Amino acid sequence: CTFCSIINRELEGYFVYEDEKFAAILDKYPVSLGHTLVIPKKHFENYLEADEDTLAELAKVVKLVSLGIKDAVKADGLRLLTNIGRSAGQVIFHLHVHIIPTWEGDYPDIFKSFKPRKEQEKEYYELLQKIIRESIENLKRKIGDYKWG
Amino acid sequence: CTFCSIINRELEGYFVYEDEKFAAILDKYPVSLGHTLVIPKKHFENYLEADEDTLAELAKVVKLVSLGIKDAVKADGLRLLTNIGRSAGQVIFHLHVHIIPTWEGDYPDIFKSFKPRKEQEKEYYELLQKIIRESIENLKRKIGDYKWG
Ligand SMILES: [Zn+2]
Ligand SMILES: [Zn+2]
């Protein structure tokens, strides 16, 4: 499994979020700048096979990571989706939610050339990971369980 | 708001699921047969504006309704998605999750002519509502809080 492999560090992946049961990883072949996948660490074939507690916490992680990404890449919108079955477009059979950023215009200048739907240069993953992590950390400081400003 | 209106019975909508805080309604201009929208009754502009408890329960309702729809229309797959912002395709600003059925071939014979992305004839809504409700009721009987077979 591609995701179980990334979780176990057997396959390369850039984490932007991680806790004991969940993680968010940059998509290797991003549809748009900042495209990220949020996944439960435990392996479930799809959304319908996951227990309610996992789905409930997954929804909360998706919110946090989405807020973080929107802030980091200054997105005007976000598309959230998960596919169940090959006829619905599922190709990785480990439950994951896509967070695909959108803009009414063009993405920030701070970001350089981007090749939609293809593998990017190493620099892309390193920068996106760092800025997204920075945005998420701030969200934990102003709206986290131990927020203070 | 189109969804608040449907919830308050001020605007026509076919419910396939409903409880004190959530509801699932057939999409009026379905992308595919059985296309349904799951919504929290309370009004939230999008996914990011909803509190964690609402998102957690929403995820659970989405699972139940999805299982029900897949069974009812004998789908091979399902696409689940929610849009945040007009640039991501959002047009109804009341948080809702799309459940769009897919098939590797064609949908069941029991179903007649279907016009993708357009308003269907009254018969479509009446039949889909009835079969989906029937499937959901069964799910509550075999895997519900008071299941027994
Ligand atoms: Zn896996
Ligand atoms: Zn509303």
Residue A96 designated active-site: yes
Q: What is the nearest CA distance from B53 to chain A, expressed in angstroms?
A: 8
Q: Is A35 a known ligand-binding residue? A: no
CA B108 to CA B69: how far, in whole Å? 13
Q: 3-state SS string over chain B?
A: CHHHHHHCCCCCCCEEEECCCEEEEECCCCCCCCCEEEEECCCCCCHHHCCHHHHHHHHHHHHHHHHHHHHHCCCCEEEEEEEECHHHCCCCCCCCEEEEEECCCCCCCCCCCCCCCCCCCHHHHHHHHHHHHHHHHHHHHHHCCCCCC
Domain residue ranges in chain B: 1-149
- Which among A78, A90, A92 has a CA at the least distance from the CA of B77? A90
Cα–Cα distances (Å) from A24 to A101, A106, B14, B26, B70, in that order, read 14, 24, 36, 32, 28
Query: Please, what is the Cα angle at B39 between B74 and B111, to 5 degrees?
Result: 25
The CATH label, of 3.30.428.10, 3.40.50.970, 3.30.70.270, 3.90.79.10, for the domain at A1-149 is: 3.30.428.10
Catalytic residue among B96, B101, B125, B136: B96
Task: Name the residue of chain A whose CA is nearest to B103's CA.
Answer: A87
Spatial CB neighbours of B11, under 8 Å, sequence gap ≥ 6: B2, B5
Structure token pair of residue A118: 């293809």
Ligand nearest to the CA of A96: 1
- A143 neighbors A64 (Cβ within 8 angstroms): no
Cβ of A88 within 8 Å of Cβ of B79? The answer is yes
Structure token pair of residue A40: 């439960």
Q: What is the nearest CA distance from A70 to chain B, expressed in angstroms?
A: 10
The answer to whether B78 contacts chain A (CB < 8 Å) is: yes
Q: Is B4 a known ligand-binding residue? A: yes
Q: In angstroms, how far is the first alpha carbon of chain A from the final one? A: 40
The answer to whether A67 contacts chain B (CB < 8 Å) is: yes
List the resolution, Å.
1.8
Q: Distance from the CA of B119 to the center of ligand 2, in angstroms?
A: 21
Say which amino acid occupies A95: L
Experimental method: X-ray
Alpha carbon B40 to its chain centroid, in Å, reads 11
* Coil, strand or helix at A49: helix
The answer to whether A52 contacts chain B (CB < 8 Å) is: yes
Cβ of B86 within 8 Å of Cβ of A79? The answer is no
Nearest-CB residue to B55 (from A63, A87, A104): A63
